[PDB]
Amino acid sequence: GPLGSLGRRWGPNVQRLACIKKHLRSQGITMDELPLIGGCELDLACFFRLINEMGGMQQVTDLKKWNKLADMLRIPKTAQDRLAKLQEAYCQYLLSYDSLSPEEHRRLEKEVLMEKEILEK
Known part of the structure; x- marks a missing residue:
């Protein structure tokens, strides 16, 4: 197929979502x-970046603004639990x-990061 450009790094968004998933x-x-x-x-990658872009998690949660950060994440406002959930x-x-x-970062990261890098050989 035309797709399948694996071999090297999959990207930051993939690395972030991967590390968190693992x-x-x-x-x-x-x-x-x-x-x-x-x-x-x-x-997770889009959400993580969003929180960081909001002056850190402290701001997002402390200043109570999940509504905006989440809004950009494409979430249904009709959900009366999306906020609390x-x-x-x-x-x-x-x-x-x-x-x-x-440690948990380097260990979990080094594992995934290598898994993709050395995925070829």
Whole structure:
């Protein structure tokens, strides 16, 4: 097929979503199928970047503005649980992972990063 340009780095968005996924499952959270929020699909890479762009997680959560950051993430406003589900969804995901020490980062990252780099040979 025309697709299949594997071999080197898959990209930052892929590396981020991969690292979080590996940790989530290894932490007791099975996310092999697909993550969902507010009845819709969400990209950990896109979500992670969004929070960081909001002056860090502290701002997003403390200043109570998940509505805006999430809005850009493409979430249904009709969901009366997307707001609360999101708060707990990130607090139990992004928070936990983001709390990981340099070891869990290098270990989990080095594993995935190499898995893709040396995927060829």
